């Protein structure tokens, strides 16, 4: 009961930082994967 009650907030914080790191990443019409600055993260999404 302690573990479930404690470690739920540990993983809740993990998910929050992950979402903010990745939220602006979108597939564009040329197949590239880019963020809001237009930086290329992958030249083709999922490599396939």
């Amino acid at each position: 009961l302690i573990d479930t009650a404690v470690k739920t907030a540990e993983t809740g914080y993990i998910q929050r930082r992950l979402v903010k790191a990745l939220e602006d990443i979108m597939v564009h019409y040329d197949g590239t994967t880019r963020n809001s600055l237009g930086d290329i993260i992958q030249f083709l999404y999922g490599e396939d």
Binding site: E23, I25, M26, V27, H28, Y29, D30, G31, T33, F43, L44, Y45, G46, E47, D48
Partner: protein, 146 residues
């Protein structure tokens, strides 16, 4: 039997299959794992074709050998991920579908089409069209917040 000109195609087919097996076993999948997530499941598409056209029967097939080899090879040029004629795009387009082309060729091999799946002329042309249509449908859609 004896036709050396038809044997030149089948040799080129088997040579292609030897390249793939050597490439995949020594570079891609060193540990020998051969079950992998891949697009559009060919096993299900074939057994549906067997049902629509009642592909039971020992009724010898009218499907000629050059139709098979040229049919499959022409298919692998229509699996468009990226369109455009630029030289870099064609290399990228070929790279993106390298693993999937090997998968197709490993199934639509001459002996298997004729002995195992037993496709006729009507069914085989249908199988090519379905693969082509379903691969397009499996591309990720632009705008997806991946």
């Amino acid at each position: 039997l004896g036709d050396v000109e038809l044997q030149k195609e089948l040799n080129s087919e088997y040579e292609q299959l030897v390249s793939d097996r050597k490439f995949l076993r020594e570079i891609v999948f060193v540990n020998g794992d051969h079950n992998w997530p891949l697009p559009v499941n060919l096993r299900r598409i074939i057994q549906n074709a067997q049902q629509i056209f009642h592909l039971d029967r020992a009724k010898a097939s009218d499907l000629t050998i050059p139709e098979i080899i040229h049919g499959v090879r022409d298919l692998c040029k229509k699996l468009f991920v990226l369109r455009g004629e630029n030289e870099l795009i064609k290399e990228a387009q070929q790279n993106a579908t390298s693993l999937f082309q090997c998968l197709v060729r490993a199934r639509l091999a001459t002996r298997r089409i004729l002995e195992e799946f037993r496709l006729n002329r009507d069914a085989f042309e249908w199988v090519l069209g379905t693969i082509e249509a379903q691969f397009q449908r499996s591309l990720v859609h632009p705008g997806e917040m991946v």
